[PDB]
Structure 1
Amino acid sequence: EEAFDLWNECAKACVLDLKDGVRSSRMSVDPAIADTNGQGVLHYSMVLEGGNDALKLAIDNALSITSDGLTIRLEGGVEPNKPVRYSYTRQARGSWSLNWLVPIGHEKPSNIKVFIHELNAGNQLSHMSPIYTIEMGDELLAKLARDATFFVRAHESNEMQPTLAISHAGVSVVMAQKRWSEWASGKVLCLLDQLDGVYNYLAQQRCNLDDTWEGKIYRVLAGNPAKHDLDIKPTVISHRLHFPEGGSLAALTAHQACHLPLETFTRHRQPRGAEQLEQCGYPVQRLVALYLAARLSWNQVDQVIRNALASPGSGGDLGEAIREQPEQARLALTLAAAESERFVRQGTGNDEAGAANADVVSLTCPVAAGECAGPADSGDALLERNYPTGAEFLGDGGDVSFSTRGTQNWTVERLLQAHRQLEERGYVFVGYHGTFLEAAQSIVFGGVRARSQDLDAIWRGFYIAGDPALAYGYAQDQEPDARGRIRNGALLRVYVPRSSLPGFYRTSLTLAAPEAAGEVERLIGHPLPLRLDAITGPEEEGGRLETILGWPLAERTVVIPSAIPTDPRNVGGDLDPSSIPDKEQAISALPDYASQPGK
């Protein structure tokens, strides 16, 4: 009849008659699994063969997949007015693997992941779609992990008696030895035994998982999932997140400024109490929203902040939000401004208003490759390029955070260990960066991101200095906070992969010099601004050196704390040389930079 048993009949191979209407199969999993006290991931998959190009499949009304031979459309979610929706353009003809991940555990994410693998004749994995995230809410996830129905119906088939062939249908579970960071990044692939080796190949680096998931245990619960041989295109791993109610730029900014998962902002129910969420996450999200709702163009951010701070009670909601957290506002608004500007310049089809609601495409970028590009279909999305950050190079010693009282749990000993780890991973020190506390948190944990800057376009980029004393001058608030006090900031150490050194140049000229622009372009071999390259030269005639990293290069830095403290009793004062640890000086010489263009 209408029913069939997916995991028993299609574990090897089945041919489903679709000529008489929809076919359905219950997918039941032992409830003891969804109720585990630990954490795990259920990986549901099946290979769709002949007939996979004229289908409308569904898991209850929670997830729908429409395949017409050209695209595979996905839509679903728990929220009734704005379905989460995605569309994957097929890159091949033939069989494809349908995959969805359901997390289990008490503090689990409230969404599922969905992805598609295209397979060649040899049954090898040839292409992989982006990893799509669909918000479900806690209760619906529980239902998807225990009892849901899989529906299959022919859709615009040209067959007189349509059929669908399915093979290797099944479900597995991986239990960790609560950590959910991999789930939101490219490392989610590292949790899936069925895809061993993919992350290493595409990210060009080992999974290097922390103990929790490193010691995972895998088990097939039903059916017989496939483990495809690889013949995959080197396309970087990507994620795509659709914001049905808009607010993507605000969420992206909050996630990058605060080091909070992007998907925390698309949750069905907002978490409460979380310190970083209440103090940074929601405030930053709201600030960007207010700016967008005020109908202000991003190129006026500096003046908007200046006016809000200069006149109490002015600016209304946005003005008050800014005055409430001056530096956090500057970080948030300049981050959003830079991303909106980039989005608009991606194509004539993008504008400032659209940047506010565009999907976010997150890329797992190899550190040695050239520039990190997303899928052809990502030109209409906000983009994030992810590389290893300081968060991975802090070593043991406890939680690190930034405060006026100094960097938490950070000592010379810890710095030396971190520096050695960086060397072992192929990184090299290129200088110091001084900044305010909130920016230090963003940069070290979330990674360096472009921010709008009020300076000539040709000189925009990430500013650092080999001399900690020059960077120290920037390590403080540039404007008093709500309580009218200029806080000391933090001094940070900036590293880059050694493979990036050939792109570092030096000049004897000061950047203000009229000959500067042309000379730097001659050295880097292309028009400014800087891209995967950098320039070092005197900050002024007879001055200390300053280094600018092009934003693409800045994004792949690893930034960690310096053991040189900022003096809370002398904010605005010069760095006292005796406060620099001798052992930190010993690991702070700078590389030999090129003084001529490449041959």
Structure 2
Amino acid sequence: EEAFDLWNECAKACVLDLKDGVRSSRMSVDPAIADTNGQGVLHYSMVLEGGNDALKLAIDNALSITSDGLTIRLEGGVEPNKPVRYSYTRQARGSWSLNWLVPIGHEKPSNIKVFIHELNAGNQLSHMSPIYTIEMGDELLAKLARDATFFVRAHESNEMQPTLAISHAGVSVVMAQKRWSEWASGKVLCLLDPLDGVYNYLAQQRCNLDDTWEGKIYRVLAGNPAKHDLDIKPTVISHRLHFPEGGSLAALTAHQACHLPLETFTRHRQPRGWEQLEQCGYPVQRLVALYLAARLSWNQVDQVIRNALASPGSGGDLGEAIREQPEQARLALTLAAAESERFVRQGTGNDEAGAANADVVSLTCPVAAGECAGPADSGDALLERNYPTGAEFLGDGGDVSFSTRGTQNWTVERLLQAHRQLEERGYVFVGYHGTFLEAAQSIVFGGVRARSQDLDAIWRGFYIAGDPALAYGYAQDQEPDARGRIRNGALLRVYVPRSSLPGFYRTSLTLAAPEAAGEVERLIGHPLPLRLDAITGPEEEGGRLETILGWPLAERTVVIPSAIPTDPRNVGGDLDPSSIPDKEQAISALPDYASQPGK
């Protein structure tokens, strides 16, 4: 009576009577699937048609959807108290597809993904909602992938006898040939047959999946999932993550500074033994949390750090966290500062206090387009713009990491291969960036991110230098140690898409001159700071050149290691030209920059 069989009755099309109360259907999948020894993703979907605008649906109490015709509200999760909550604003009227992904495997993520596809009259995919993440924990995920109940009830319906029409209800499973990198990014869509081509179109790049998911095999387990023809609005793929107990800025900073998935920080259970999480992740998360609690305006990060390092035992808990890892503290706090500032300047309703707990919206950004903008409803969120990073262009040779002993598994041979791969993907070398070890990890793997800087706002941006000898001066820590030793850093190679070259300008005017600002603004055609453009000019009168990439452009760079090593025995010394591999020099000429504004 109240029960129904979703995958039998609604695989093609069903009309469910809701006039007598909630309707329910058990969703059971072979337990052998949830207990697989490899990795996979169960993709549950259904198309909701007539009656989809006055409905409250739920999978157990784990996931609940409320659709009133204007929005689709989603909430749930395993944790009590305030649940994980999201709200999607309908961009169309009509049918929409409900989708949720449940990962399976022994080292799987502990959350599910949920997304909506709005469909037009012709059953074409017209709009896709952000991909929402809801924390479930391992046991509830097992339950969601074995036996859960689907509930549907009418909600504020204007119908005398409300009904809900469902079509193409079903579940499929994709098995990989363990990496879950795609899961947290826009590439998660590349794992779903029904979405074939969506990533290529929206990201304007091939999925280029690694072997694991490249050789995936998919099977429909029940029902008859829909595969809609596309007619989607050109909107970048986005993810949204809500932090019920706050601390989003801290998690975002840890994720970007350490190159750790964002969702690691929203896990029901903390991972154990994860070295990078224990040494970088949690410490950075804690550092940002401490700074926010001290109610210090992010504009004083530099002084807060100087004071903490100047007098031991000062600054309280925040001061001590800083002293424990100076450089990591500089990286984390300056990254958090820059993001909070952007957040506050986003809208009138955003303030420094709110940046600490705002949802995180992550965008899959095309590198050739203009600036990467988030959806209309992302104005109240922290934003992350993601582009290909050095992590994708290291080539073969084993894990790469930065150390005082040098860059692991990095040789001139490997570099030449990576450089060719970069050319094949449309990138071009524009210079060197020298920095400390933690920043190198962040930049190469996680990607370049804006950081607050102590200089006039108009000159804010990512600083690089065509001459490795100039960049070398910055490839180190900027503070001695208890043993009177400063760690050596790493020299990095910065690349940008060739399509970005028209935005690179040059001036013979020392960027330190009085009329510098005006001349650069004349060249770039807009007021500073730099946006999707760059300026190269002498660092000082009669000196070597420096290049500044506006942050928007900096984010779309690909940065990889240089084969030019830093010297642990001569930190502070000048680059020994004899240490520069001749073959690296051969791939280090710089592009021809524009000396006049565009006409």
Q: CA deviation at 1:123?
A: 0.2
Map of 2:202 onto structure 1: 202
Q: CA deviation at 1:479?
A: 1.5
Identity %: 100
Three-state SS of the structure 1 residue aligned to 2:542 is: coil
Q: CA deviation at 1:337?
A: 0.2
**TM-score in terms of structure 1 length:** 1.00
Per-residue displacement from partner, 1:273-296 (whole Å, max 9, x unpaired)?
111000000000000000001111
Map of 2:428 onto structure 1: 428
Contact 1:323/1:481 (<8 A) preserved: no
Per-residue displacement from partner, 1:113-139 (whole Å, max 9, x unpaired)?
000000000000000000000000000
Of the structure 1 ranges 68-77 and 510-519, higher mean CA displacement relative to structure 2 is found in: 510-519
Task: Measure, in 2, the Cα distance between the counterparts of 1:21 and 1:567.
Answer: 74
Of the structure 1 ranges 509-518 and 473-482, higher mean CA displacement relative to structure 2 is found in: 473-482
Per-residue displacement from partner, 1:165-185 (whole Å, max 9, x unpaired)?
000000000000011000000
Task: Measure, in 2, the Cα distance between the counterparts of 1:147 and 1:332.
Answer: 43
Per-residue displacement from partner, 1:335-370 (whole Å, max 9, x unpaired)?
000000000000110000000000000000000000
Contact 1:325/1:481 (<8 A) preserved: no
Total equivalences in the alignment:
599
Three-state SS of the structure 1 residue aligned to 2:257 is: helix
Per-residue displacement from partner, 1:40-90 (whole Å, max 9, x unpaired)?
000000000000000000000000000000000000000001200000000
Per-residue displacement from partner, 1:295-331 (whole Å, max 9, x unpaired)?
1110000000000000011111110000000000000
Q: CA deviation at 1:512?
A: 1.7
Q: CA deviation at 1:511?
A: 1.6
Per-residue displacement from partner, 1:238-261 (whole Å, max 9, x unpaired)?
000000000000000000000000
Task: Measure, in 2, the Cα distance between the counterparts of 1:349 and 1:358.
Answer: 12
Three-state SS of the structure 2 residue aligned to 1:151 is: strand
Q: 1:551 to 1:215 in 2, by over 3 A?
A: same
Three-state SS of the structure 1 residue aligned to 2:11 is: coil
Q: CA deviation at 1:485?
A: 2.8
Per-residue displacement from partner, 1:462-514 (whole Å, max 9, x unpaired)?
00000000000000001135665310000000000000000000001112211
Contact 1:361/1:384 (<8 A) preserved: yes
Q: 1:83 to 1:19 in 2, by over 3 A?
A: same
Task: Measure, in 2, the Cα distance between the counterparts of 1:199 and 1:216.
Answer: 16
Contact 1:326/1:481 (<8 A) preserved: no
Task: Measure, in 2, the Cα distance between the counterparts of 1:355 and 1:166.
Answer: 40
Structure 1 position 74 matched with structure 2 position 91:
no
Q: CA deviation at 1:220?
A: 0.2
Contact 1:387/1:556 (<8 A) preserved: yes
Task: Measure, in 2, the Cα distance between the counterparts of 1:579 and 1:29.
Answer: 60
Contact 1:325/1:482 (<8 A) preserved: no
Per-residue displacement from partner, 1:17-57 (whole Å, max 9, x unpaired)?
00000000000000000000000000000000000000000
Contact 1:324/1:482 (<8 A) preserved: no
Task: Measure, in 2, the Cα distance between the counterparts of 1:263 and 1:121.
Answer: 36
Contact 1:324/1:481 (<8 A) preserved: no
Map of 2:2 onto structure 1: 2
Q: 1:481 to 1:346 in 2, by over 3 A?
A: farther
Unaligned runs of 5+ in 2: none
Q: 1:176 to 1:483 in 2, by over 3 A?
A: farther
Alignment of 1:121-200 (within 5 A): 121-200=121-200
Three-state SS of the structure 1 residue aligned to 2:380 is: coil
Map of 2:497 onto structure 1: 497
Of the structure 1 ranges 304-313 and 479-488, higher mean CA displacement relative to structure 2 is found in: 479-488
Of the structure 1 ranges 504-513 and 248-257, higher mean CA displacement relative to structure 2 is found in: 504-513
Three-state SS of the structure 2 residue aligned to 1:567 is: coil
Task: Measure, in 1, the Cα distance between the counterparts of 2:484 and 2:314.
Answer: 17
Q: 1:166 to 1:402 in 2, by over 3 A?
A: same
Task: Measure, in 2, the Cα distance between the counterparts of 1:420 and 1:576.
Answer: 26
Three-state SS of the structure 2 residue aligned to 1:379 is: helix
Q: CA deviation at 1:547?
A: 0.2
Map of 1:294 onto structure 2: 294
Task: Measure, in 2, the Cα distance between the counterparts of 1:470 and 1:131.
Answer: 43
Task: Measure, in 2, the Cα distance between the counterparts of 1:512 and 1:42.
Answer: 57
Contact 1:432/1:491 (<8 A) preserved: yes
Task: Measure, in 1, the Cα distance between the counterparts of 2:323 and 2:379.
Answer: 35
Task: Measure, in 1, the Cα distance between the counterparts of 2:361 and 2:318.
Answer: 28
Task: Measure, in 2, the Cα distance between the counterparts of 1:199 and 1:349.
Answer: 33
Of the structure 1 ranges 507-516 and 109-118, higher mean CA displacement relative to structure 2 is found in: 507-516
Three-state SS of the structure 2 residue aligned to 1:345 is: helix
Task: Measure, in 1, the Cα distance between the counterparts of 2:277 and 2:231.
Answer: 42
Task: Measure, in 1, the Cα distance between the counterparts of 2:142 and 2:481.
Answer: 45
Contact 1:326/1:482 (<8 A) preserved: no
Q: 1:171 to 1:578 in 2, by over 3 A?
A: same
Of the structure 1 ranges 481-490 and 133-142, higher mean CA displacement relative to structure 2 is found in: 481-490
Task: Measure, in 1, the Cα distance between the counterparts of 2:402 and 2:526.
Answer: 38
Unaligned runs of 5+ in 1: none
Contact 1:323/1:482 (<8 A) preserved: no
Three-state SS of the structure 2 residue aligned to 1:133 is: strand
Q: CA deviation at 1:263?
A: 0.1
Task: Measure, in 1, the Cα distance between the counterparts of 2:577 and 2:58.
Answer: 66
Map of 2:512 onto structure 1: 512
Q: 1:315 to 1:482 in 2, by over 3 A?
A: farther
Three-state SS of the structure 1 residue aligned to 2:220 is: strand
